[PDB]
Amino acid sequence: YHEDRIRAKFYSVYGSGQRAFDLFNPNFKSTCQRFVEKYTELQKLGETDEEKLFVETGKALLAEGVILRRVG
């Protein structure tokens, strides 16, 4: 899927979230999925750059209180 490209980058940059996946809940949303949804919203607002669309997404989540610890 197109979002798999965003997931590969998110896992490389920020790693797997210290939050644990709950695959029993069919509506579970991980930090990566929350990142992907925000990344998708900002792309639809007309932004087309990839490196810029990725940095603005992290800021939005930090504003919402999400913990994003860069791996390196």
Partner: protein, 97 residues
């Protein structure tokens, strides 16, 4: 048709291929310190790739570099130069007691 159908593309989660410790670095016959890390301390024997972990290309470069350095007067043949015994041990071989 349908937006949720899978799309054709290359694996985005694919990991890079493994690399030997010497991948991307020039192997010179004059760099005896590097070459000495791949010979036996007691016998000077060149280690096989199963001990050095090197790839086929670098295993050959190191081997050819050692043979050149030995016969040109840069590297001993029958033992590892004792100056290089305290260098990083990059070879998967355990000897002593």
């Amino acid at each position: 048709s349908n937006e949720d159908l899978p799309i054709s593309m290359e694996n985005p989660y694919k990991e890079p291929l493994k690399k030997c410790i010497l991948c991307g670095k020039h192997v010179d016959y004059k760099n005896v310190q590097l070459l000495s890390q791949f010979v036996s301390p007691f016998t000077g024997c060149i280690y096989g790739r199963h001990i050095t972990g090197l790839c086929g290309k670098k295993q050959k470069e190191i081997t050819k570099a050692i043979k050149r350095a030995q016969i040109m007067g840069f590297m001993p043949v029958t033992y590892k130069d004792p100056a290089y015994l305290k260098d990083p041990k990059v070879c998967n071989i355990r000897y002593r007691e």
